[PDB]
């Protein structure tokens, strides 16, 4: 076979610990997710604007006692208008608040006034892989694989959970003192335990069953994973045009075309990601995540040393003191007014 | 061509 006996007696030990590991993060996020207002506005004082969408904007932040720095999410109470906006938000507090894994983001404080929610997570001062690869063009293939490695263990770990991601794409990836990445955006984050049928992400990274308005499961995070890599390793994703509804007919269409610099067992990881029919797409299989995880473009992956940090980066950003923001873009600035009177009190109970 | 700067995520669409 491909592995001796050696290597296929510790490659199934190992299947067997992580199945060991599972049992007991399942056991810990339970605990957390049945037993779900840790702070005010007026504990922080607020820096910078890292980023921004189209519900609100993560800013610096620095609390007023302590000195720590943290990125806190506001998001408009009223701007949260749409009705899958609304439990879209109650969704992101209540997975992040239970979830524990070293490439997801820790949330810190939440909490609420009369005009926005907010969530206060750490700060990751090295900015999104999103400006790094814009700048650098592309990751070569060990580069690449060394993120989508992360990747594909914190997907493990959330779809151990009866949760799925929604939001795959480099914009939504902060990369961390040590080069590892941190997985920040939990707005589309839903706990599913066979199908759901809500149509939202991001155009370029939409698997073809949610374009197609069928009830999808976890492999659309599998999909994303592919245009993830594609993208990282091409520089640009798979599924390439100027408006929305042009990028969904190239996805639906099951043709992929890759740069001639790609290897051949990089492109056959991502024809079996990029897999419009269900029934053949990696990591929706018999075998689940270990068709990924022991592909060939995967064989050099100590599964275990990357999660336990163990692996040396292949980039850490350059760092110039808490609360430095050089790595991040800049944006407008706009004021965070806070009414007189409640807004959408109702419809928060539970934030 | 296609869509180069950071890209909004759909939430009905
Ligand atoms: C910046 C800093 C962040 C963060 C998210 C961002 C932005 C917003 C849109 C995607 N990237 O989440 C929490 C940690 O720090």
């Known amino acids: 076979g491909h592995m001796g006996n050696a290597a296929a007696a510790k490659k199934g030990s190992e299947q067997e610990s992580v199945k060991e590991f599972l049992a007991k993060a399942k056991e810990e996020f339970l605990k957390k997710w049945e037993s779900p207002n840790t702070a005010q506005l007026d504990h922080f004082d607020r820096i910078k604007t890292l980023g921004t969408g189209s519900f609100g904007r993560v800013m610096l932040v620095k609390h007023k006692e302590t000195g720590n720095h943290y990125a806190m999410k506001i998001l408009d109470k009223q701007k949260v208008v749409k009705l899958k906006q609304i439990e879209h938000t109650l969704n992101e507090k209540r997975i992040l608040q239970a979830v524990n894994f070293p490439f997801l983001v820790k949330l810190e404080f939440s909490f609420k006034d009369n005009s926005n929610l907010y969530m206060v997570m750490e700060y990751v001062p090295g900015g999104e892989m999103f400006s790094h690869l814009r700048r650098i063009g592309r990751f070569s293939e060990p580069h690449a694989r060394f993120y989508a490695a992360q990747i594909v263990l914190t997907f493990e770990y959330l779809h151990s959970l009866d949760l799925i991601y929604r939001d795959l794409k480099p914009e939504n990836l902060l990369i961390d003192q040590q080069g590892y990445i941190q997985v920040t955006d939990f707005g589309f984050a839903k706990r599913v335990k066979g199908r759901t049928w809500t149509l939202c992400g991001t155009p370029e990274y939409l698997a073809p069953e949610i374009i197609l308005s069928k009830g999808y499961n976890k492999a659309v995070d599998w999909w994303a994973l592919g245009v993830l890599i594609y993208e990282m390793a091409a520089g640009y994703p798979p599924f390439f045009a100027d408006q929305p509804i042009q990028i969904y007919e190239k996805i639906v269409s099951g043709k992929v075309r890759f740069p001639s610099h790609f290897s051949s067992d990089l492109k056959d990881l991502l024809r079996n990601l990029l897999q419009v029919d269900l029934t053949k797409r990696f990591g929706n299989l018999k075998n689940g995540v270990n068709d990924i995880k022991n592909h060939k473009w995967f064989a050099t992956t100590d599964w275990i040393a990357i999660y336990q940090r163990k692996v040396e980066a292949p980039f850490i950003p350059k760092f110039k003191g808490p609360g430095d923001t050089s790595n991040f873009d800049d944006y407008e600035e706009e004021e965070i007014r806070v009414s007189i009177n409640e807004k959408c009190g109702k419809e928060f109970t539970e934030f | ?13």
Request: proline content about 0%.
């Open chain 2, 1 to 13: 061509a296609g869509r180069t700067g950071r890209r909004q995520a759909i939430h009905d669409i």
